[PDB]
Backbone atoms as SQL, in Angstrom:
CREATE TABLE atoms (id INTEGER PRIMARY KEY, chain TEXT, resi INTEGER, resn TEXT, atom TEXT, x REAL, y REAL, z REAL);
INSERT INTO atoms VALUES
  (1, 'A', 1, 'UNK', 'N', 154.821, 46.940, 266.251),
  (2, 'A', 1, 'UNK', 'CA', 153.902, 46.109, 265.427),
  (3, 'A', 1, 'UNK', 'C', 153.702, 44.749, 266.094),
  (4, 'A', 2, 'UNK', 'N', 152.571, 44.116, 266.203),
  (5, 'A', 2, 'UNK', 'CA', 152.083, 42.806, 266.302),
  (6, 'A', 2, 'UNK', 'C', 152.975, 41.444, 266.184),
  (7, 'A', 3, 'UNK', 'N', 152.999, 40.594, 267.383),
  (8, 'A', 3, 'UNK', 'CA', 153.772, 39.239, 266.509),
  (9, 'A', 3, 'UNK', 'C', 152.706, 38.450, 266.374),
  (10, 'A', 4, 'UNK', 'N', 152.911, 37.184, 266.000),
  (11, 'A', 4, 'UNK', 'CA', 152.415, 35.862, 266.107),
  (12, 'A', 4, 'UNK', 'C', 151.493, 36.284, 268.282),
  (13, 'A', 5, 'UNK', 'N', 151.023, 35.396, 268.363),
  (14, 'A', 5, 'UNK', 'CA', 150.421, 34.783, 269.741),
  (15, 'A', 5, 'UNK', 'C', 150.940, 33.913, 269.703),
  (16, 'A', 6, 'UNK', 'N', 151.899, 33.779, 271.397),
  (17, 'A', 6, 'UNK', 'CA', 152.724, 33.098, 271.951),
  (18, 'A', 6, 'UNK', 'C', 152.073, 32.911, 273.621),
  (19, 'A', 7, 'UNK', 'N', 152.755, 32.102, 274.371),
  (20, 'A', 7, 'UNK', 'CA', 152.006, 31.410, 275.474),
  (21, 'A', 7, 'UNK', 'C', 152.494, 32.707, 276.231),
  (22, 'A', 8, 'UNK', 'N', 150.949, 32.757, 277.237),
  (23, 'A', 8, 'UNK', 'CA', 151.157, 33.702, 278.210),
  (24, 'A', 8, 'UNK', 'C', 150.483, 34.825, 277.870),
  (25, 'A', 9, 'UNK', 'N', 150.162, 35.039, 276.384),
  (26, 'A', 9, 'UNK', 'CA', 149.770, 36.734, 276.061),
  (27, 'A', 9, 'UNK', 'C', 147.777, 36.240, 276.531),
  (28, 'A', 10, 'UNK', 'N', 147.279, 37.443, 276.558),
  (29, 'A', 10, 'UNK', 'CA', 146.237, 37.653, 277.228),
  (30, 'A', 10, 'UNK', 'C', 145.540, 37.920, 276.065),
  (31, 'A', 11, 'UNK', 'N', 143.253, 37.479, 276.180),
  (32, 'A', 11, 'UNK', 'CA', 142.821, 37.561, 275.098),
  (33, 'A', 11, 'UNK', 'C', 141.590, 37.632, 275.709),
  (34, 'A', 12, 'UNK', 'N', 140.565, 37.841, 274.786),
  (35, 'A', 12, 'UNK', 'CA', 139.265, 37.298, 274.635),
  (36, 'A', 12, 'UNK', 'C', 139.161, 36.143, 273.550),
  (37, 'A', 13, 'UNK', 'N', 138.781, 35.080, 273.901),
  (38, 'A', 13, 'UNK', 'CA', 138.371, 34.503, 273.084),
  (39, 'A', 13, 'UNK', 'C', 136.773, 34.165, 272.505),
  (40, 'A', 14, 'UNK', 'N', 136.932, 34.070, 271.729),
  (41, 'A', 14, 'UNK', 'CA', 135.421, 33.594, 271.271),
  (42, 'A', 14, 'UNK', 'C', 135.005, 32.127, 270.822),
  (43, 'A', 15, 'UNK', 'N', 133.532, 32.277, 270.841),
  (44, 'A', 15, 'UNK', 'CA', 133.339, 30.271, 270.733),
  (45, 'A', 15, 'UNK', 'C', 131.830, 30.668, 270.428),
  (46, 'A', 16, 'UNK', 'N', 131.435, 30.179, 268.900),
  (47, 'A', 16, 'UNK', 'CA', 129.956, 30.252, 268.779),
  (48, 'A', 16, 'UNK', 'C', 129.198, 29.924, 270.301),
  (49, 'A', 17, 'UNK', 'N', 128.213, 30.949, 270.156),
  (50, 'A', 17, 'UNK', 'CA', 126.917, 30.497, 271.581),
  (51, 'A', 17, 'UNK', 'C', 127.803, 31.390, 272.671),
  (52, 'A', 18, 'UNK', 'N', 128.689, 31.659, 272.726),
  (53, 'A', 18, 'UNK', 'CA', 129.279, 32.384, 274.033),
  (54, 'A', 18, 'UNK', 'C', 129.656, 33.412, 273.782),
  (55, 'A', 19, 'UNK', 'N', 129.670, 34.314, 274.929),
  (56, 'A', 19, 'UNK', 'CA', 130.119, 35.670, 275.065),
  (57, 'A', 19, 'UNK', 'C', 132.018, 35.676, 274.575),
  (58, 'A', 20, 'UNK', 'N', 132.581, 36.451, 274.409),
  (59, 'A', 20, 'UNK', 'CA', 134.054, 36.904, 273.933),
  (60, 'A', 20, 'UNK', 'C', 134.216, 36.740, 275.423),
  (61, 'A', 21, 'UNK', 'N', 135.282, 35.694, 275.778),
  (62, 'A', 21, 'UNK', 'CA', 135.752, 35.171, 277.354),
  (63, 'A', 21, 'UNK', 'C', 137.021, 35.160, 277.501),
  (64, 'A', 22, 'UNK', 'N', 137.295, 36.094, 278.972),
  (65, 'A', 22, 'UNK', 'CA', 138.921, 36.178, 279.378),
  (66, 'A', 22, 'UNK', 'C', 139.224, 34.584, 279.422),
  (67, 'A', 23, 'UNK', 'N', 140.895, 34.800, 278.753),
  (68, 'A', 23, 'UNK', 'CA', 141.553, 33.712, 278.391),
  (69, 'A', 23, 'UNK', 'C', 142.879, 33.849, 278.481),
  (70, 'A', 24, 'UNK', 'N', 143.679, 33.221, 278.081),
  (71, 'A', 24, 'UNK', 'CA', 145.393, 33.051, 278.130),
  (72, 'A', 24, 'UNK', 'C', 145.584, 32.111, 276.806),
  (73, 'A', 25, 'UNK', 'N', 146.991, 32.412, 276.408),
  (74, 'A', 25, 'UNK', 'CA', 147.286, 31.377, 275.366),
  (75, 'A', 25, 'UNK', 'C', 148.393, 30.709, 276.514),
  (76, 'A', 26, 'UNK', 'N', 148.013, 29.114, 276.752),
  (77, 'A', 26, 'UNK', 'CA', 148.862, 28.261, 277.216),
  (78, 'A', 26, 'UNK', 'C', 149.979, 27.921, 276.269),
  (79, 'A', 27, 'UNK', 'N', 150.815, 27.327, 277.381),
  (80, 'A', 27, 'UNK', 'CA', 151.866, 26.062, 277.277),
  (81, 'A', 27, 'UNK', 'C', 151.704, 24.855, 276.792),
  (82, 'A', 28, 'UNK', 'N', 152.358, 24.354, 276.309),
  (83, 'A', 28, 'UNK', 'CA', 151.713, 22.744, 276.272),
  (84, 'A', 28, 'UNK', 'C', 152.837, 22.133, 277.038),
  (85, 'A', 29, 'UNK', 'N', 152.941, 21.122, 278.179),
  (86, 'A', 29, 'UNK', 'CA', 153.790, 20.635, 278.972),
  (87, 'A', 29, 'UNK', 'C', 154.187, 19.187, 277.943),
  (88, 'A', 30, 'UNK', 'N', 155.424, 18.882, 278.687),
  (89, 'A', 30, 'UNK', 'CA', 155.676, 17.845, 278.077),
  (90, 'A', 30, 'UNK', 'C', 154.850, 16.610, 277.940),
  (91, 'A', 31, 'UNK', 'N', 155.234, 16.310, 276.917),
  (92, 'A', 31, 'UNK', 'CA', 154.067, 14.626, 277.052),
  (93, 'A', 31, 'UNK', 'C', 153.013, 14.991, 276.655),
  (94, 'A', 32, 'UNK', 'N', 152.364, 15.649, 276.630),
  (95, 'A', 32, 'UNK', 'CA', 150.805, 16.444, 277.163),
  (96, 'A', 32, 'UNK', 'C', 150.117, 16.360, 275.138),
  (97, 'A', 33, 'UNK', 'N', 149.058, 16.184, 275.311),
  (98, 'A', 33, 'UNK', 'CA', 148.167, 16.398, 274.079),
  (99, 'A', 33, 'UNK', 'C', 148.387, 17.642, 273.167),
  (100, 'A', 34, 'UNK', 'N', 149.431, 17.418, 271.878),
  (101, 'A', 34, 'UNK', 'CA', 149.099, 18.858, 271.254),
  (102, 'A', 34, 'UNK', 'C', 147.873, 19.133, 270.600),
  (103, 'A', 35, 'UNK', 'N', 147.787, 20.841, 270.065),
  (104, 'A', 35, 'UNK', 'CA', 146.437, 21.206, 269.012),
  (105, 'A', 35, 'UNK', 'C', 146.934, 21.001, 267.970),
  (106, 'A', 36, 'UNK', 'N', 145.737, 21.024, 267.103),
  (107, 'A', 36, 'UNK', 'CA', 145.803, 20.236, 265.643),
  (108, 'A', 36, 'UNK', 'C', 146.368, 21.602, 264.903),
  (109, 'A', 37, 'UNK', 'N', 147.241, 21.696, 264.116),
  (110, 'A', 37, 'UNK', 'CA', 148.168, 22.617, 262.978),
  (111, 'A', 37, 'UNK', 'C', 147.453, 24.011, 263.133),
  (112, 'A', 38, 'UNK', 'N', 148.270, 24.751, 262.849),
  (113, 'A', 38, 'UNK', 'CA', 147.350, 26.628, 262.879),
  (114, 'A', 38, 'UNK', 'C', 146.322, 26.774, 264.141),
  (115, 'A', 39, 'UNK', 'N', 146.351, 25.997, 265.370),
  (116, 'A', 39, 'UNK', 'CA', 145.546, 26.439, 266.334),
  (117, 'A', 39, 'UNK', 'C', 146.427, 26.557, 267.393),
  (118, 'A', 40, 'UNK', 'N', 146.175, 26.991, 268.903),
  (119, 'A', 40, 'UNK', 'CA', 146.525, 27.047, 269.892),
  (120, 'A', 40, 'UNK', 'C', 145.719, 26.606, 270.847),
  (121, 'A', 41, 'UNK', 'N', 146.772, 26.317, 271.843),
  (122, 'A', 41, 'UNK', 'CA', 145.406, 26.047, 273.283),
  (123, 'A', 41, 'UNK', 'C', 145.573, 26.878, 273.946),
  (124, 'A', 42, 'UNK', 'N', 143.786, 27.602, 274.142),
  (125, 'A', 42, 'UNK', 'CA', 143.277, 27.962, 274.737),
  (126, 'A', 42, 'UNK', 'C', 142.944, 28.131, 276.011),
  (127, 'A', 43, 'UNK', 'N', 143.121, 28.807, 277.357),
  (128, 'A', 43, 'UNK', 'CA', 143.061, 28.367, 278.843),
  (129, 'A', 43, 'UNK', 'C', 141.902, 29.390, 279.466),
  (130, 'A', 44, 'UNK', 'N', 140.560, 29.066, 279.525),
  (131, 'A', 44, 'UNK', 'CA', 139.426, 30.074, 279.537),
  (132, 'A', 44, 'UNK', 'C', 139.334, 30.453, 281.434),
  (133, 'A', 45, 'UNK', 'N', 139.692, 31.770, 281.590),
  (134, 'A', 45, 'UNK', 'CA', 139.651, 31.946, 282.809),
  (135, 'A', 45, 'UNK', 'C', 138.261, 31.840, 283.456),
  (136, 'A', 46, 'UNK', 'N', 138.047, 31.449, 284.672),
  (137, 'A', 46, 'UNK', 'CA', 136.812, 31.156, 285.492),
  (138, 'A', 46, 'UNK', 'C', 136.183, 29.860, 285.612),
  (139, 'A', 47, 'UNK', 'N', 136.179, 29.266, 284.129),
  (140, 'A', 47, 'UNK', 'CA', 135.461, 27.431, 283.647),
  (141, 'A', 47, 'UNK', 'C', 136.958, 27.018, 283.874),
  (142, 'A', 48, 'UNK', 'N', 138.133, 27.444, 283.516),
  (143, 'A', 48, 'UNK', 'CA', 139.355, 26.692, 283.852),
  (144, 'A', 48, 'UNK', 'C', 138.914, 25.454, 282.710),
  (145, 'A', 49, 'UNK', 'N', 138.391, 25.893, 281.613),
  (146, 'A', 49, 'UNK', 'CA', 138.514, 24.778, 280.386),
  (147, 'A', 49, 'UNK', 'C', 139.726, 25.397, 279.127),
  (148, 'A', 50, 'UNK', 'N', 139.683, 24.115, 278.292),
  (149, 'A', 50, 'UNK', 'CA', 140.994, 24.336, 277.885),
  (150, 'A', 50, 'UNK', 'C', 140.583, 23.742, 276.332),
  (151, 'A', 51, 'UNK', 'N', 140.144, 24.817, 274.926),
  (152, 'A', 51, 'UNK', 'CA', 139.748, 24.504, 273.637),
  (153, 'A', 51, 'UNK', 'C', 140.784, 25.211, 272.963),
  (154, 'A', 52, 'UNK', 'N', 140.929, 24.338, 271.794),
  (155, 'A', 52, 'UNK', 'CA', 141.864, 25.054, 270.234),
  (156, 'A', 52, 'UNK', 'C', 141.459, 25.421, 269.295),
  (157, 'A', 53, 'UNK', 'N', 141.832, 26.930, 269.890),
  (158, 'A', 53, 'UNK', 'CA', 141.198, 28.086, 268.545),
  (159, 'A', 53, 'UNK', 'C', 142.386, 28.170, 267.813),
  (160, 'A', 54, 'UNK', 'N', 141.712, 28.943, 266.901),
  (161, 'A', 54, 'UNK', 'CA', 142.289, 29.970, 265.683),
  (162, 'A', 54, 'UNK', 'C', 142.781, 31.347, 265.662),
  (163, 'A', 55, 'UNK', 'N', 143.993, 32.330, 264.802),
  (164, 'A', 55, 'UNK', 'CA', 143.585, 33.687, 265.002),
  (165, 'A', 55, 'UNK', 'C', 142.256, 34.231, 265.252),
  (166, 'A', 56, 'UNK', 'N', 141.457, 33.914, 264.624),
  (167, 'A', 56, 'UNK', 'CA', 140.427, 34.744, 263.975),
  (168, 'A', 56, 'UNK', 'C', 139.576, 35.102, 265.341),
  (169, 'A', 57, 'UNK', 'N', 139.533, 34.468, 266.198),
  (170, 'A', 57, 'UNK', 'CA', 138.849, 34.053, 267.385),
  (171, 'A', 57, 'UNK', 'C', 138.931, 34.425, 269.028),
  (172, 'A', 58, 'UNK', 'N', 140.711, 35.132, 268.298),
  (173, 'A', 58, 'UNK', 'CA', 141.591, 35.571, 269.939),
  (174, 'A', 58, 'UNK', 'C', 141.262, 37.015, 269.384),
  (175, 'A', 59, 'UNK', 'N', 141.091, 37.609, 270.420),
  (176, 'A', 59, 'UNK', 'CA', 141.491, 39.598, 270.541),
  (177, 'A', 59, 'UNK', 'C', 142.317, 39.790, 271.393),
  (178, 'A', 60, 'UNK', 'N', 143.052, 40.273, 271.466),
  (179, 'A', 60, 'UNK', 'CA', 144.224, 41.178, 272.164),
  (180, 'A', 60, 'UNK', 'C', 143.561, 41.478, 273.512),
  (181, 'A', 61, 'UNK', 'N', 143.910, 41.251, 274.870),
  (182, 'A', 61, 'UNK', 'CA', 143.031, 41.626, 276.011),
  (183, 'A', 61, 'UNK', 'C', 143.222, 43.135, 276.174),
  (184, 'A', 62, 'UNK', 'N', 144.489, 43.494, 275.988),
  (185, 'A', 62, 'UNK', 'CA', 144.418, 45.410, 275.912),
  (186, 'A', 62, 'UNK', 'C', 143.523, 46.091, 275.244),
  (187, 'A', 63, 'UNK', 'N', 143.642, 45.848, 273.985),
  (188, 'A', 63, 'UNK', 'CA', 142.787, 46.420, 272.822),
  (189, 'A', 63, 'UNK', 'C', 141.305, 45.811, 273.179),
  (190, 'A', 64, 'UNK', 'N', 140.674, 44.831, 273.770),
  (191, 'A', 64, 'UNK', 'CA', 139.640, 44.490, 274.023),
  (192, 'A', 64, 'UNK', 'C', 138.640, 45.112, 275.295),
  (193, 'A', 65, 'UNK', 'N', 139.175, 45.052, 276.091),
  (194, 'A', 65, 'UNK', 'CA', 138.795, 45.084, 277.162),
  (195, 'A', 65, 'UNK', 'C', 137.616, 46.218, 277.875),
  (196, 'A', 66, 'UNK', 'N', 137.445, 46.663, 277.032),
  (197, 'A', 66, 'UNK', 'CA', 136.664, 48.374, 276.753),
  (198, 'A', 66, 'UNK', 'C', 135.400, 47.468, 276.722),
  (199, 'A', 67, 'UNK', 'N', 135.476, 46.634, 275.286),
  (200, 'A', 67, 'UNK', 'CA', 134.179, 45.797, 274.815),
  (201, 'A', 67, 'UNK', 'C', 134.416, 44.738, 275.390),
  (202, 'A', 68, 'UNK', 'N', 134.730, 43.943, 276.186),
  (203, 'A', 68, 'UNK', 'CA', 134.497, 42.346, 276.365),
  (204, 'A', 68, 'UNK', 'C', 134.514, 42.594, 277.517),
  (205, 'A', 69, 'UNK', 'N', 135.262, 43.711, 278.508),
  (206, 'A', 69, 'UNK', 'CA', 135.550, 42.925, 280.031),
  (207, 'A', 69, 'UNK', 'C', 134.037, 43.824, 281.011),
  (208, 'A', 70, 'UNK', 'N', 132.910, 43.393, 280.648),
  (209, 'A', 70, 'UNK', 'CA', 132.112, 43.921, 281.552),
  (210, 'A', 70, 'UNK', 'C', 131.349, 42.162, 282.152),
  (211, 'A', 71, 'UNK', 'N', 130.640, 42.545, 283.356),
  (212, 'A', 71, 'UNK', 'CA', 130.001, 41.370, 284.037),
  (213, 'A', 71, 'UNK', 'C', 128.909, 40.772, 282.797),
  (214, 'A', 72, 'UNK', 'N', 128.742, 39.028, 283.011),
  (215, 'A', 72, 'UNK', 'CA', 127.963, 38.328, 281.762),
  (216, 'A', 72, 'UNK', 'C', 127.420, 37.077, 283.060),
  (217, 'A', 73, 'UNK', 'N', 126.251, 37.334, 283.133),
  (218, 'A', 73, 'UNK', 'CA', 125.531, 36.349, 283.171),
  (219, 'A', 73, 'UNK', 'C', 126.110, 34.779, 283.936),
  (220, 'A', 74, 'UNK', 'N', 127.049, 34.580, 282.484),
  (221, 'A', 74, 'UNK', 'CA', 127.101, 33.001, 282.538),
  (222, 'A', 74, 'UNK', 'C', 128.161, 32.311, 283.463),
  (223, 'A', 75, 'UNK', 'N', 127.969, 30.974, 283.540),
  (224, 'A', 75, 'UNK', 'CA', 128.867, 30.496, 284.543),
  (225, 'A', 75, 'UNK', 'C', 130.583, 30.813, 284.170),
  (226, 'A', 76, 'UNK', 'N', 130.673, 31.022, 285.854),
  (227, 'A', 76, 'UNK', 'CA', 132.424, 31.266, 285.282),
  (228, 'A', 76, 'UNK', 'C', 133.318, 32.574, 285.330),
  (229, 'A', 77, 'UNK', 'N', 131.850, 33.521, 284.399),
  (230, 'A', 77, 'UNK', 'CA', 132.730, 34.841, 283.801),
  (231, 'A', 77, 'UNK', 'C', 133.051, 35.337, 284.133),
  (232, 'A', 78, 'UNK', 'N', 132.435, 36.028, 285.444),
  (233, 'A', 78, 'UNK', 'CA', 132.766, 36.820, 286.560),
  (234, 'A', 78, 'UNK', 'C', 134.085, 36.301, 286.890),
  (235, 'A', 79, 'UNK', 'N', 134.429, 35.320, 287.525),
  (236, 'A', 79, 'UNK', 'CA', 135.533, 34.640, 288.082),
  (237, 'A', 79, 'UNK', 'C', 136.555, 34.841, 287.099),
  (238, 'A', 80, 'UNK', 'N', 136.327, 34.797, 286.230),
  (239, 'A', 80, 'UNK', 'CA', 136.900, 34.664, 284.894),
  (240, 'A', 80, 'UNK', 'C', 137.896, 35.983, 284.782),
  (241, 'A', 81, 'UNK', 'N', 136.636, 37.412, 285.018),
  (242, 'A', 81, 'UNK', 'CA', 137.119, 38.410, 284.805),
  (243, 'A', 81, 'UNK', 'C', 138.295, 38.910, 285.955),
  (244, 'A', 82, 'UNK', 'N', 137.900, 38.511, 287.080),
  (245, 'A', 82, 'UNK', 'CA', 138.766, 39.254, 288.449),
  (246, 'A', 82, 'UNK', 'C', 140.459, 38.104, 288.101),
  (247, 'A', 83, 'UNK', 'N', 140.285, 37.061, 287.383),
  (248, 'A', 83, 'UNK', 'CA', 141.368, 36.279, 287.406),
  (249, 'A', 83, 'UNK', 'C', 142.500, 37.085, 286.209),
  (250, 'A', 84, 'UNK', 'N', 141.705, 37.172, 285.032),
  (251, 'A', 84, 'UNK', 'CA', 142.652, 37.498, 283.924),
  (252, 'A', 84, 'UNK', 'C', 143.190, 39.488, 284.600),
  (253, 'A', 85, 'UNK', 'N', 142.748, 40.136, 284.976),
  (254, 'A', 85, 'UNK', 'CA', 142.903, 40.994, 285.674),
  (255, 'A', 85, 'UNK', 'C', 143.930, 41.059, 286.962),
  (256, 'A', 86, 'UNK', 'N', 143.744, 40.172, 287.938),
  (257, 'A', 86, 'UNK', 'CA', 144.551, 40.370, 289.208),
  (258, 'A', 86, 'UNK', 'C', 145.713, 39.065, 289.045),
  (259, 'A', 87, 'UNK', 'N', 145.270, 37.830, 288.103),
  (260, 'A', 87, 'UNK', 'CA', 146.143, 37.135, 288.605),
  (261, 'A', 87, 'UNK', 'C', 146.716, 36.225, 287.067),
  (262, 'A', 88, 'UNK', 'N', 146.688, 36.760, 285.847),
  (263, 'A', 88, 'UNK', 'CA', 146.704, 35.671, 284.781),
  (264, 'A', 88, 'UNK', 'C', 147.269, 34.883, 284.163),
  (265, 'A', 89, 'UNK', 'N', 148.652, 34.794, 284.939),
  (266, 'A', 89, 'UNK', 'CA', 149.602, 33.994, 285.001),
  (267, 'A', 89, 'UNK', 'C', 149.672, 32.388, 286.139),
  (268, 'A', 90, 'UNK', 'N', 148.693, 32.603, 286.787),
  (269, 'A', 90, 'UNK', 'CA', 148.712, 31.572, 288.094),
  (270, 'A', 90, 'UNK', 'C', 148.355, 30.383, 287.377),
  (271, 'A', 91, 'UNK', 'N', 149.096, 29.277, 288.514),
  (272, 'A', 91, 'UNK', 'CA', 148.211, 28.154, 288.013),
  (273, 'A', 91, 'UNK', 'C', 147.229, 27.748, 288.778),
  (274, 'A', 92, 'UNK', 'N', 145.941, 27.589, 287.927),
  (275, 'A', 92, 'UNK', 'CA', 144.696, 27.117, 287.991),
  (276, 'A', 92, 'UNK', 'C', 144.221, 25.565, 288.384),
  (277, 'A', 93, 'UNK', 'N', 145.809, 25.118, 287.979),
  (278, 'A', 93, 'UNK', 'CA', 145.077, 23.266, 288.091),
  (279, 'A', 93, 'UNK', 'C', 144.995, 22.682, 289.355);
């Protein structure tokens, strides 16, 4: 059965106006800016941007990937996709 989302697990996320985008649930390093209560940060593979969602918003990248992981258009995704795939643990910064 399912836990909570913890740093490291793999997703699609979603964001009004955008396609469902390979992602990671980050870390937060020390010192570093937390998210505001009931959210997480977000680490969007390809844009290498970093927003705080909600459950409602993450999918499971296993269970997803049928529907979300095909080529999109927009900036990023592509990159996006070969990263959460071959490498989705690396650091990006």
């Amino acid at each position: 059965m399912p836990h909570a989302f913890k740093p490291g697990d793999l997703v699609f996320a979603k964001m009004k106006g955008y396609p469902h985008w390979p992602a990671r649930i980050d870390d937060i390093a020390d010192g570093a800016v937390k998210p505001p209560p009931n959210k997480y940060p977000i680490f969007f593979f390809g844009t290498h941007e970093t927003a705080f969602l909600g459950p409602k918003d993450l999918f499971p990248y296993d269970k997803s990937k049928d529907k979300y992981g095909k080529p999109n258009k927009r900036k990023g995704f592509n990159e996006g996709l070969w990263e959460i795939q071959n490498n989705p643990h690396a650091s990006y910064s």
